[PDB]
UniProtKB/Swiss-Prot annotation, chain A:
Protein name, entry field: Histone-arginine methyltransferase CARM1
Subcellular locations according to the entry: Nucleus; Cytoplasm; Chromosome
PTM remark: Methylation enhances transcription coactivator activity. Methylation is required for its role in the regulation of pre-mRNA alternative splicing.
Gene label: Carm1
Annotated function: Methylates (mono- and asymmetric dimethylation) the guanidino nitrogens of arginyl residues in several proteins involved in DNA packaging, transcription regulation, pre-mRNA splicing, and mRNA stability. Recruited to promoters upon gene activation together with histone acetyltransferases from EP300/P300 and p160 families, methylates histone H3 at 'Arg-17' (H3R17me), forming mainly asymmetric dimethylarginine (H3R17me2a), leading to activation of transcription via chromatin remodeling.
Subunit structure: Homodimer. Interacts with NR1H4. Interacts with SNRPC. Interacts with the C-terminus of NCOA2/GRIP1, NCO3/ACTR and NCOA1/SRC1. Part of a complex consisting of CARM1, EP300/P300 and NCOA2/GRIP1. Interacts with FLII, TP53, myogenic factor MEF2, EP300/P300, TRIM24, CREBBP and CTNNB1. Interacts with RELA. Identified in a complex containing CARM1, TRIM24 and NCOA2/GRIP1. Interacts with NCOA3/SRC3. Interacts with SKP2. Interacts (via PH domain-like fold) with C9orf72. Interacts with PARP1; promoting PARP1 recruimtent to replication forks.
Positions of region (Interaction with C9orf72): 5-108
Curated annotation (Swiss-Prot), chain B:
Name assigned to this protein: Histone-arginine methyltransferase CARM1
Family membership: Belongs to the class I-like SAM-binding methyltransferase superfamily. Protein arginine N-methyltransferase family.
Subcellular location: Nucleus; Cytoplasm; Chromosome
PTM entry text: Methylation enhances transcription coactivator activity. Methylation is required for its role in the regulation of pre-mRNA alternative splicing.
Organism: Rattus norvegicus
Region (Interaction with C9orf72): 5-106
Length: 108, 106
C-alpha cells in the first residue's frame, strides 16, 4: 500500500471448477480466455485469473501445504475447501514455466 | 517368509482415465466397481485396484515425490509420466481413511 508486483503472465488459460458431491464429477463453472498472473513470493505463489472485462474469476495462494498436482501434459489442479479448480495452459511450455515457479515457491 | 502386514481395502472405488489430446477429459477408462487396496510401507504406499474377477486394472507406488492431490471431498488424482488417473471413493469417509494412510509416505 502502495506496492508494485512483477507477475508472470500466461494468456489464454482455461479454468474448470469441479466437485464430486454427486458421486461422480460436477462441473460448477467453466471459463476460457483467462489471463493468469502469478506473483512469486518467498513461501507461496499468488495465483489470479482475469477475464477480458477485468473480472477476477479466481484467486488463491499456493504454498507447501496446498493440495495440488500436475494433470496430464499442460494442466494443474488446485484443491481448497470442497471444490477443485483445474487450470489448462495454452501450451506444455507455458505449463512447465508455471510449474517451475510453483516448485520454487513451495520449497522443492 | 514370514512377517505380518496390513492391507487396507476400499470396495466400490472407481477409476477414470484423464485424457488430453484435443481438449476435454478423454475417458480411456471409466471403470465401475473396483476394490482399491493399499499396502503401506515406511516411505511408499503400494496402491492397486482390482476388478471382481481380481484383474489388476491400475497400480502404482505413492511416495513424497508423487504428483497427486485430493480432488473434491472423495476423489484423488495421481499423475505419472504424461498420464493422470482420477480415483473416486464410495464415500468421503472412505477417502479420508485412505488419505490419512498416505500421510506417512507423502
Ligand atoms: Cl514481485
Amino acid at each position: 500500500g502502495s506496492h508494485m508486483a512483477t507477475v508472470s503472465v500466461f494468456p489464454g488459460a482455461r479454468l474448470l471448477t469441479i466437485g464430486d458431491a454427486n458421486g461422480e464429477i460436477q462441473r460448477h463453472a467453466e471459463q476460457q480466455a483467462l489471463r493468469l498472473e502469478v506473483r512469486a513470493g518467498p513461501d507461496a505463489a499468488g495465483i489470479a485469473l482475469y477475464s477480458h472485462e477485468d473480472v477476477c474469476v479466481f484467486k488463491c495462494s499456493v504454498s507447501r501445504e496446498t493440495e495440488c498436482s500436475r494433470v496430464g501434459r499442460q494442466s494443474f489442479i488446485i484443491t481448497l475447501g470442497c471444490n477443485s479448480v483445474l487450470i489448462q495452459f495454452a501450451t506444455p511450455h507455458d505449463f512447465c514455466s508455471f510449474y517451475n515457479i510453483l516448485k520454487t515457491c513451495r520449497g522443492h
